[PDB]
Design a protein around this nucleic acid. Structure first.
Lengths: 605, 66, 18, 15, 390
DNA sequence: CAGACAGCGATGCGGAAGAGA
DNA sequence: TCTCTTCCGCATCGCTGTCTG
């Protein structure tokens, strides 16, 4: 609240300093931001404690950055951490005390939890609460009565209005409890699903699962994990532990296919007990319990097919023990978020790898599903070898003179097709691919602009893939890339970042970018994170290039596009010039060649 | 002939921007007296300060405000 | 037959005392 | 063998 | 360096400067490797010796060390060819110099210097001294232009600010000596005192200024005896740098925070720590004032917390690379005053003028293909005079 | 600035035409 | 004759862009 002569807020008169400050490696700002030391001998103990109560926002190598909020604190109580259980240790760990504002905030957040509990039974949602006083003063707003369908006091609530009420209670200072007591539940018989000994659970995976299962009752929340970290395995394990009906929801045809393979590979459950509620193909969804479906079909808004209609009615009627939603970052979408209310589930676990977006709808994920249970440390995984180390880089490609003139001259937005297609980046990518091609490194180019992607591919006569590409040709190209030594590069369009199972690649060039989308960058980055059989963290075998054009709008997006990655700890190095580019022969080595491309670019319209 | 002014050298990308400025009369005058080279141009001394300001505005567009 | 996760949170920081 | 490229090993900025 | 200072002096002042007590000794330590040995050898000799002997007294290998040593001392004029006997005054004085004839202080020096820097920056609370302010103003690192308003800081002031204390102080005293002559203070008398430290009206005023900079402290109500501080004769780092342009400095002295704020945005200030971010806005702001990226990297490097000393390089490459790039963008458009030519009827005259400009150095740039060139306004008169002369 | 609509590039779904037993 | 497989036609989302206030 107090501002120094500079921008920083003043806290000299706010909180004191512990005499043994050096022993205590923890800081506590009044705003809730916390700065831990990654060099302290007791760093690990602090890391576990802070992660339990706070959600990371920046975890560079030396000094991590944690901020706590109401959602973060509620999760701590769910795992059994009381206000004194956390504040006492926080004061002990704090090297500068705890400001009263945080103290009262912690007290208010912890006490305002568990008073209101939401339980669904017999397809009816009852807002149970041991304390009756909470309900008495909770019915002041008229929305509650109209929302409601027309000790331990409970009342049934309308199915459709659950989401509206859930967000209302969050700002009402009375969060709802979504814990599932699968251990004590006889209404829905347990499913015959078991985890085979073959599956191996990594220490972070166990910790993420442990945080989800704070007590005998499973907690509904979001577990963010890298795609190469094996987030699919964790989802399977959670379903196996619940031992009740689970409805995994994908986002595309590829997503549903992989999940079924993951279930069979890691779960002993029989093949016949798994169904694919997919329009393209089905396996008698009503017949068995464990099902894999997609947001589009379940949330499909237009006319429903007769066969789908029966399945949809069957899904609505039944009650699901678990509702795994992979790629939760798309949930707050209008159609996608409707699926939450359409189906009934006790705890709706959420998995993903890039929990970031521009529109401030990510915060809704806290109430749409639950608090962010776990968010693995990408840097720590790199040290442990679970994830391939990446030498993130940003190759600056100076714009050719003529190209800039039209780019600056025109105030229209043809520039997206212009600065994405310039000779220097073309030579840069052409040179960059050539260097990696002779190094036996697998390349995965990317480009939002299909027009640029096709032009780059034909000139480099490489197997470019994109949306309307035939499925058969899509598989044929991938198989050659994985197997054929003669080919070690595939030019994938945006479809690559959506969902796929691609072979591990040593490098990932990105000539163009869709825009300032932290999702796409992290989505595309996860492709090379696939750990190799016998690599090492320090070898930096995996690389990532995000080619950009200097003095162009592309730079603004690139800096705005790397915010999420740097927060994890990745350092994006800049490369003004590439050694050996001049000696190596490359296309567009003469003014005429650039002129024809510019004319074609201008003729694009 | 002899012409007064100042000579400014920059990368070819910027040189094109200056050519756009004079051609489009962004500053209202064809300050570019002559093009010495692909990376060199000549401008009137009085208009250097305002021209440098415009380039500073250009950098803001191609740089995110962290 | 329950799993280790159902037992409870590890509470790694409880070991240290001051 | 399998050594990192020059433009990644050291800064390529003219400084 | 001190060698540069003594090098630029006349023979007349040099021997006078070679005072008996110390100067013959202080200038001796300066002698890097070999001149020390040669000085002692010809210290008891009253007979000059031929120049050939000195040349052949160093083996063929490392012969360069001989030439640089002899050249260095010839400027110092310790000997004369006399045809290489040493100066009798120096010989006598040196022979007289060779068998012939605290914890609180450093804190005071640390504190007194710190307050001076506080005044140097726009610190509302600082020590007031009219003599000190004007001295810095005429030192070339400050300009007021308005006695009523406090003086501001020039471009050179910021560069001086980020320098390390030894280089910062040494340069500061260097200007004092140059300005001492301008104000009329004898250079020799004041200079000799500095040497005597490492072992009149002007002296009292000179000592008063030294006492003001924190180098000395009488401690006895300005008595004749003085106890020089450590800085008179001539530490761990604290800043922690992340990979996301975030600085965590364990600074309690407001000076360090003020220095960091010059090229970064401050976010939080804890009792024993402060959080700052190195964003484009701050760095270019510092570059605009006059700083260059080298000082910031050096300043961050020198004040490097031990935690990041283990990693090599100490400063992460991205932070260093980004800082260098930000300054480079500022000077993309390099402005250079000049005068252009047009309408060259013949290239021979243009070539002849080009040769004339090259001889005089007036030319700044030329274009053979376009038959044109640029000349600075200073050389514009010279070429214009040449054109008139035809 | 700001709210509504729309473009380019991706996805899903549901209604109608070729080989093959 | 089914049957599968495959191909148009709707609808949706990410992110940005345009347009008049």
């Amino acid at each position: 609240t107090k501002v120094d002569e500079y921008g920083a807020k003043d806290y000299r008169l706010q909180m004191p300093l512990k005499d043994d400050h050096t022993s205590r490696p923890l800081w506590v700002a009044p705003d809730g931001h916390i700065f831990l030391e990654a060099f302290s001998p007791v760093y690990k103990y602090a890391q576990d404690f802070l992660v339990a109560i706070a959600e990371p926002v920046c975890r560079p190598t030396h000094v991590h950055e944690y901020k706590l909020t109401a959602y973060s604190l509620y999760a701590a109580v769910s795992v059994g951490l009381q206000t004194s259980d956390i504040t006492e240790y926080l004061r002990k760990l704090s090297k500068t005390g705890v400001p009263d504002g945080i103290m009262q905030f912690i007290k208010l957040c912890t006490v305002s939890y568990g008073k209101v509990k939401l339980v669904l039974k017999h397809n009816r949602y009852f807002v149970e609460s041991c304390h009756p006083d909470v309900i008495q003063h909770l019915l002041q707003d008229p929305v509650i009565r109209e929302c409601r369908l027309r000790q331990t006091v409970s009342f049934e609530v309308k199915q459709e209005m659950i989401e509206e009420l859930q967000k209302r209670c969050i700002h009402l200072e009375y969060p709802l409890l979504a814990e599932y007591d699968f251990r004590n539940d006889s209404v829905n018989p347990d499913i015959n699903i078991d985890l085979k000994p073959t599956a191996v659970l990594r220490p972070y995976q166990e910790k993420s699962l442990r945080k989800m299962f704070g007590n005998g009752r499973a907690r509904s929340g979001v577990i963010v994990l890298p795609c190469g970290a094996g987030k699919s395995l964790v989802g399977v394990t959670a379903a196996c532990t619940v031992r009740k009906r689970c409805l995994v929801l994908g986002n595309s045809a590829v997503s549903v296919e992989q999940w079924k393979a993951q279930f069979k590979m890691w779960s002993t459950i029989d093949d016949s007990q798994i169904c694919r509620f997919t329009s393209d193909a089905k396996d008698k969804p009503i017949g068995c319990s464990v099902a894999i479906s997609t947001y589009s079909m379940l949330g499909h808004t237009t006319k429903r097919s007769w066969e789908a209609e029966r399945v949809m009615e069957w899904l609505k009627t039944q009650e699901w023990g678990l509702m795994i939603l992979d790629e939760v970052h798309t949930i707050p979408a209008k159609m996608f978020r409707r699926v939450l209310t359409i189906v009934q589930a006790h705890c709706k676990l959420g998995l993903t790898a890039t929990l970031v977006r521009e529109d401030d709808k990510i915060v809704d994920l806290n109430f749409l599903i639950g608090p962010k249970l776990y968010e693995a440390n990408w840097m720590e995984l790199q040290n442990n070898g679970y994830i391939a180390k990446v030498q993130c880089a940003e190759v600056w490609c100076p714009m050719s003179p003529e190209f800039y003139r039209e780019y600056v001259a025109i105030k229209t937005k043809k520039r997206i097709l212009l600065y994405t297609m310039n000779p220097n980046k073309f030579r840069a990518c052409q040179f960059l691919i050539k260097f990696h091609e002779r190094r036996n490194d697998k390349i995965i180019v990317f480009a939002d602009n299909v027009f640029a992607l096709k032009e780059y591919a034909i000139r480099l006569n490489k197997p470019y893939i994109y949306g309307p590409t035939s499925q058969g040709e899509r598989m044929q190209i991938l198989q050659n890339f994985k197997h054929n030594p003669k080919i070690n590069t595939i030019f994938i369009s945006k479809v690559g970042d959506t969902s796929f199972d691609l072979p591990e690649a040593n490098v990932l060039i990105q000539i163009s970018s869709h825009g300032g989308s932290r999702r796409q960058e992290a989505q595309r980055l996860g492709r090379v994170l696939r750990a190799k059989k016998g690599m090492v963290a320090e070898e930096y075998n995996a690389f990532f290039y995000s080619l950009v054009s200097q003095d162009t709008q592309e730079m603004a997006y690139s800096t705005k596009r790397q915010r999420f990655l740097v927060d994890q700890g990745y350092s994006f190095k800049v490369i003004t010039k590439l050694a050996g580019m001049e000696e190596e022969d490359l296309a567009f080595s003469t003014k005429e060649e650039q002129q024809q491309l510019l004319q074609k670019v201008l003729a694009a319209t | 002939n002899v012409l007064k002014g100042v000579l400014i050298e920059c990368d070819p990308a910027m040189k094109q921007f200056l050519l756009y400025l004079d051609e489009s009369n962004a500053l209202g005058k064809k300050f570019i007296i002559q093009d010495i080279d692909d990376t060199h141009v000549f401008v009137i001394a009085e208009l250097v300060n305002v021209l440098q300001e415009r380039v500073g505005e250009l950098m803001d567009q191609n740089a995110f405000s962290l | 037959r329950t799993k280790r996760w159902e037992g409870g949170y590890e509470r790694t920081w409880e070991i240290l005392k001051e | 063998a399998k050594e990192r490229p020059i433009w990644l090993r050291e800064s390529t900025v003219q400084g | 360096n001190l060698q540069e200072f003594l090098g630029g002096l006349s023979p007349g002042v040099l021997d006078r400067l070679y005072g008996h007590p110390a100067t013959c000794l202080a200038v001796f330590r300066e002698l890097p490797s070999l001149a020390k040995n040669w000085v002692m050898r010809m210290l008891f000799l009253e007979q000059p010796l031929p120049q050939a002997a000195v040349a052949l007294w160093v083996k063929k290998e490392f012969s360069k060390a001989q030439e640089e040593s002899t050249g260095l001392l010839s400027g110092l004029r310790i000997w004369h060819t006399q045809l290489l006997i040493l100066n009798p005054i120096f010989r006598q004085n040196l022979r007289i110099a060779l068998l012939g004839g605290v914890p609180s202080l450093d804190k005071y020096a640390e504190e007194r210097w710190e307050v001076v820097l506080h005044f140097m920056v726009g610190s509302p609370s600082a020590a007031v001294s009219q003599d000190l302010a004007q001295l810095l103003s005429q030192a070339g690192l400050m300009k007021s232009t308005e006695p009523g308003e406090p003086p501001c800081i020039t471009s050179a002031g910021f560069q001086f600010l980020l320098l390390d204390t030894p280089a910062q102080l040494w340069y500061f005293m260097l200007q004092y000596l140059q300005t001492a002559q301008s104000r009329g203070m004898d250079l020799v008398e004041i200079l000799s005192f500095l040497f005597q430290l490492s072992f009149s009206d002007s002296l009292l005023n000179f000592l008063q200024h030294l006492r003001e900079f924190g180098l000395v402290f009488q401690r006895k109500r300005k008595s004749r005896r003085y106890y020089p501080t450590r800085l008179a004769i001539n530490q761990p780092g604290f800043i922690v740098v992340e990979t996301n342009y975030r600085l965590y400095a364990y600074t309690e002295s407001e000076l360090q925070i003020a220095l960091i704020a010059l090229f970064s945005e401050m976010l939080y200030r804890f009792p024993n720590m402060v959080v700052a971010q190195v964003t484009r806005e701050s760095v270019q702001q510092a570059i605009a004032s006059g700083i260059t990226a080298q000082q910031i990297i050096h300043f961050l490097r020198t004040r490097a917390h031990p935690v990041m000393l283990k990693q090599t390089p100490v400063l992460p490459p991205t932070i260093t690379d980004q800082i260098r790039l930000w300054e480079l963008e500022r000077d993309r458009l390099r402005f250079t005053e000049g005068v252009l030519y047009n309408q060259f009827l013949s290239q021979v005259d243009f070539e002849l003028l080009l040769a004339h400009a090259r001889e005089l150095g007036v030319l700044v740039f030329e274009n053979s293909a376009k038959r044109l060139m640029v000349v600075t306004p200073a050389g514009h008169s010279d070429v214009k005079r040449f054109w008139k002369r035809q």
